[PDB]
Design an enzyme around this catalytic site. Structure first.
Site, mmCIF file in Angstrom:
data_model
loop_
_atom_site.group_PDB
_atom_site.id
_atom_site.type_symbol
_atom_site.label_atom_id
_atom_site.label_comp_id
_atom_site.label_asym_id
_atom_site.label_seq_id
_atom_site.Cartn_x
_atom_site.Cartn_y
_atom_site.Cartn_z
ATOM 1 N N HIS A 33 0.685 -1.199 0.077
ATOM 2 C CA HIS A 33 0.012 -0.118 0.288
ATOM 3 C C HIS A 33 0.689 1.386 0.254
ATOM 4 O O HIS A 33 0.913 2.507 0.517
ATOM 5 C CB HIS A 33 -1.074 0.326 1.030
ATOM 6 C CG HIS A 33 -2.323 -1.047 0.635
ATOM 7 N ND1 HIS A 33 -2.043 -2.195 1.940
ATOM 8 C CD2 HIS A 33 -3.063 -0.983 0.250
ATOM 9 C CE1 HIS A 33 -2.680 -3.060 1.252
ATOM 10 N NE2 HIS A 33 -3.564 -1.672 1.089
ATOM 11 N N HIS A 88 -6.497 7.403 -3.385
ATOM 12 C CA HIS A 88 -6.785 5.925 -2.331
ATOM 13 C C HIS A 88 -6.814 5.325 -1.270
ATOM 14 O O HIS A 88 -7.322 4.870 -0.297
ATOM 15 C CB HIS A 88 -8.443 5.290 -3.576
ATOM 16 C CG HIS A 88 -7.350 3.548 -3.862
ATOM 17 N ND1 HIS A 88 -6.024 4.065 -4.808
ATOM 18 C CD2 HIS A 88 -7.176 2.713 -3.217
ATOM 19 C CE1 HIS A 88 -5.791 2.860 -4.661
ATOM 20 N NE2 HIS A 88 -6.040 2.476 -3.459
ATOM 21 N N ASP A 89 -5.507 4.790 -1.410
ATOM 22 C CA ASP A 89 -5.111 4.402 -0.182
ATOM 23 C C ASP A 89 -4.060 5.734 0.781
ATOM 24 O O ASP A 89 -3.035 5.055 1.235
ATOM 25 C CB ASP A 89 -3.908 3.570 -0.508
ATOM 26 C CG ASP A 89 -5.472 2.057 -0.853
ATOM 27 O OD1 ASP A 89 -5.886 1.842 -0.136
ATOM 28 O OD2 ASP A 89 -4.385 0.981 -1.159
ATOM 29 N N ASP A 139 -8.270 -0.999 -8.736
ATOM 30 C CA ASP A 139 -7.739 -1.636 -6.589
ATOM 31 C C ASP A 139 -7.033 -3.051 -7.339
ATOM 32 O O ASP A 139 -6.097 -3.769 -6.604
ATOM 33 C CB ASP A 139 -8.428 -1.415 -5.876
ATOM 34 C CG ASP A 139 -8.104 -0.548 -4.348
ATOM 35 O OD1 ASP A 139 -6.957 -0.694 -4.243
ATOM 36 O OD2 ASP A 139 -8.710 -1.206 -3.835
ATOM 37 N N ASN A 160 -4.315 -6.365 -10.693
ATOM 38 C CA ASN A 160 -3.066 -7.025 -10.223
ATOM 39 C C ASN A 160 -3.283 -8.307 -10.696
ATOM 40 O O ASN A 160 -2.343 -8.779 -11.789
ATOM 41 C CB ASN A 160 -2.456 -7.692 -8.445
ATOM 42 C CG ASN A 160 -2.289 -6.564 -7.865
ATOM 43 O OD1 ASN A 160 -2.132 -5.685 -6.166
ATOM 44 N ND2 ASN A 160 -2.100 -4.781 -8.547
ATOM 45 N N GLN A 201 -4.338 -17.597 -3.303
ATOM 46 C CA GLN A 201 -3.900 -16.457 -4.790
ATOM 47 C C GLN A 201 -5.226 -17.177 -5.528
ATOM 48 O O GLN A 201 -6.712 -16.573 -5.572
ATOM 49 C CB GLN A 201 -3.151 -16.003 -5.831
ATOM 50 C CG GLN A 201 -2.419 -15.133 -5.016
ATOM 51 C CD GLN A 201 -2.614 -13.795 -4.591
ATOM 52 O OE1 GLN A 201 -3.112 -13.448 -6.280
ATOM 53 N NE2 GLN A 201 -2.873 -13.153 -3.290
HETATM 54 C C1 LIG Z 1 -4.707 -7.773 6.235
HETATM 55 O O1 LIG Z 1 -5.714 -7.735 6.141
HETATM 56 C C2 LIG Z 1 -6.214 -8.995 5.306
HETATM 57 C C3 LIG Z 1 -5.857 -9.291 4.216
HETATM 58 C C4 LIG Z 1 -6.683 -10.068 3.743
HETATM 59 C C5 LIG Z 1 -8.086 -9.952 2.930
HETATM 60 C C6 LIG Z 1 -8.522 -11.261 2.308
HETATM 61 C C7 LIG Z 1 -10.150 -10.454 1.897
HETATM 62 C C8 LIG Z 1 -11.018 -10.987 1.146
HETATM 63 C C9 LIG Z 1 -12.370 -10.006 1.133
HETATM 64 C C10 LIG Z 1 -12.128 -9.004 0.596
HETATM 65 O O2 LIG Z 1 -13.182 -9.030 -0.556
HETATM 66 C C11 LIG Z 1 -13.271 -8.721 -2.107
HETATM 67 C C12 LIG Z 1 -11.399 -8.075 0.645
HETATM 68 C C13 LIG Z 1 -9.482 -9.591 1.068
HETATM 69 C C14 LIG Z 1 -9.015 -12.125 3.405
HETATM 70 C C15 LIG Z 1 -10.280 -12.154 4.457
HETATM 71 C C16 LIG Z 1 -10.148 -13.902 4.369
HETATM 72 O O3 LIG Z 1 -11.443 -14.430 5.691
HETATM 73 C C17 LIG Z 1 -9.685 -15.070 4.421
HETATM 74 C C18 LIG Z 1 -8.904 -14.902 2.592
HETATM 75 C C19 LIG Z 1 -8.692 -13.447 2.511
HETATM 76 C C20 LIG Z 1 -7.638 -13.469 1.241
HETATM 77 C C21 LIG Z 1 -7.039 -13.921 0.528
HETATM 78 C C22 LIG Z 1 -6.439 -13.678 -0.278
HETATM 79 C C23 LIG Z 1 -6.517 -11.460 -0.446
HETATM 80 C C24 LIG Z 1 -5.373 -11.195 -1.749
HETATM 81 O O4 LIG Z 1 -4.497 -12.011 -2.432
HETATM 82 C C25 LIG Z 1 -7.233 -11.150 0.453
HETATM 83 C C26 LIG Z 1 -6.994 -9.562 0.271
HETATM 84 C C27 LIG Z 1 -6.235 -8.694 0.333
HETATM 85 C C28 LIG Z 1 -7.102 -7.468 0.148
HETATM 86 C C29 LIG Z 1 -7.130 -6.267 1.012
HETATM 87 C C30 LIG Z 1 -6.693 -4.839 0.960
HETATM 88 C C31 LIG Z 1 -5.903 -4.440 0.171
HETATM 89 O O5 LIG Z 1 -6.274 -2.855 -0.086
HETATM 90 C C32 LIG Z 1 -5.393 -5.574 -1.278
HETATM 91 C C33 LIG Z 1 -5.739 -6.732 -0.592
HETATM 92 C C34 LIG Z 1 -7.672 -11.418 1.375
HETATM 93 C C35 LIG Z 1 -8.873 -9.465 4.362
HETATM 94 C C36 LIG Z 1 -7.803 -8.225 5.593
HETATM 95 MG MG LIG Z 2 -7.699 1.015 0.101
HETATM 96 ZN ZN LIG Z 3 -5.704 0.299 -2.915
#
Ligand SMILES: COc1ccc(C2(c3ccc(OC)cc3)c3cc(O)ccc3-c3ccc(C=O)c(C#Cc4ccc(O)cc4)c32)cc1
Ligand SMILES: [Mg+2]
Ligand SMILES: [Zn+2]
Length: 334
Positions: free
Chosen positions: A82, A122-123, A240, A243, A291
């Site tokens: 970020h 945005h970030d 956003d 990737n 992924q």
């Molecule tokens: C440290 O904070 C985090 C880290 C990961 C995530 C996840 C996730 C899942 C669903 C989403 O909704 C669209 C977003 C994030 C998440 C939640 C969950 O309960 C299980 C798997 C994953 C998972 C798996 C792969 C990923 C990415 O490959 C993610 C993610 C993400 C993410 C978070 C913030 C950003 O600005 C950009 C990307 C997440 C969320 C918050």
């Molecule tokens: Mg953001």
């Molecule tokens: Zn972002």
């Protein structure tokens, strides 16, 4: 940087790479190195010239540059994902998405400006930890914003605040009505990048796709603010989450970076005695499977719906995503 008008060894190469700014898969990491870690500044500046936005909105060049440098400074150089490179990438991605034939002449100059600006901010000032982390550790940010879109409110506050610094008001020659309208749109867009809103936002986008209407040239028809802002919200949201849709060399480097930031949050969590959040435990990790999981349940559903909206403009983007999903799947360790 310049020396008697004619360009340097690097400047020339940077200038060459900036010719790709209308293309998906810009070498954004090369541009960051070549620009002296100023990808956001040079990409925003290049895009503004390309869209002729300095003339349309009477933006003095020196004010634009001064604001962009100040904004870029407020992204954290020590956060792996970020950071300013992410912001530059989302800006450039939104720029390409704006040029999609299915939206030709749909958005006003002002809406185009709001989407790019929103993408740039945005970030901003992201500390490298999630909203849920900020809520769970009873941070100052979570306290200020009452646990609701904590980071996203902050990215906006910092984004607008920096306009008031010396020679930074890039919107100084907009009318009062334009400034109001732009401010509202930018808020609506950035607030919709909150990941907790993804499902609701995707569900509404689907509904719009099913009831989609187009004009006498295939161009999408948008009657009202609600429909217009909704498309811009999803557009920026897609950028956003773009990737996994980029060439694999870009995609892998994005993944390497986000895993590093995630693991760094999990270490911090472990030191406080907290449960480690999903994706943040380096001892219980599954990078490839994750992924694949993220693409199947989140990214592909979104981009598939976006592709339907703009069909067939986004087919190559969707094909790359699918190919990249196949590749990560193929690597899953047995
Ligand atoms: C440290 O904070 C985090 C880290 C990961 C995530 C996840 C996730 C899942 C669903 C989403 O909704 C669209 C977003 C994030 C998440 C939640 C969950 O309960 C299980 C798997 C994953 C998972 C798996 C792969 C990923 C990415 O490959 C993610 C993610 C993400 C993410 C978070 C913030 C950003 O600005 C950009 C990307 C997440 C969320 C918050
Ligand atoms: Mg953001
Ligand atoms: Zn972002």
């Amino acid at each position: 940087i310049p020396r008697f008008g004619v360009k340097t060894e690097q400047e020339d190469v940077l200038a060459k790479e900036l010719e790709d700014v209308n293309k998906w898969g810009l070498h954004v990491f090369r541009i960051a190195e070549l620009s002296g870690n100023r990808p956001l500044t040079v990409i925003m500046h290049t895009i503004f010239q390309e869209r002729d936005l300095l003339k349309t909105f009477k933006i003095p060049v020196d004010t634009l540059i001064t604001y962009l440098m100040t904004l870029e400074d407020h992204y954290h150089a020590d956060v792996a994902y970020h950071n300013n490179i992410h912001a530059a990438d989302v800006v450039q991605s939104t720029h390409v998405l704006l040029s999609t034939p299915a939206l030709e002449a749909v958005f006003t100059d002002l809406e185009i400006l709001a989407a790019i600006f929103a993408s740039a901010i945005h970030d901003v000032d992201h500390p490298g930890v999630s909203n849920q982390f900020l809520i769970n550790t009873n941070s100052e940010l979570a306290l200020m914003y009452n646990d609701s879109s904590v980071l996203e409110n902050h990215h906006l506050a910092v984004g607008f605040k920096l306009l008031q610094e010396e020679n930074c008001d890039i919107f100084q020659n907009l009318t009062k009505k334009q400034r109001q309208s732009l401010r509202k749109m930018v808020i609506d867009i950035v607030l919709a990048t909150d990941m907790s809103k993804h499902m609701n936002l995707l569900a509404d986008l689907k509904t719009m796709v099913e009831t989609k209407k187009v004009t006498s040239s295939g161009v999408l028809l948008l009657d009202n603010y609600s429909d217009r802002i909704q498309v811009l919200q999803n557009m920026v949201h897609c950028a956003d989450l773009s990737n996994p849709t980029k060439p694999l060399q870009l995609y892998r480097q994005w993944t390497d970076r986000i895993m590093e930031e995630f693991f760094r949050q999990g270490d911090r969590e472990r030191e406080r005695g907290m449960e480690i959040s999903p994706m943040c435990d380096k001892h219980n990790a599954s990078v490839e499977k994750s992924q694949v999981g993220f693409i199947d349940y989140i990214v592909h559903p979104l981009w598939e719906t976006w592709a339907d909206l703009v069909h067939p403009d986004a087919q190559d983007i969707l094909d790359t995503l699918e190919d990249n999903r196949e590749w990560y799947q193929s690597t899953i360790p047995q």
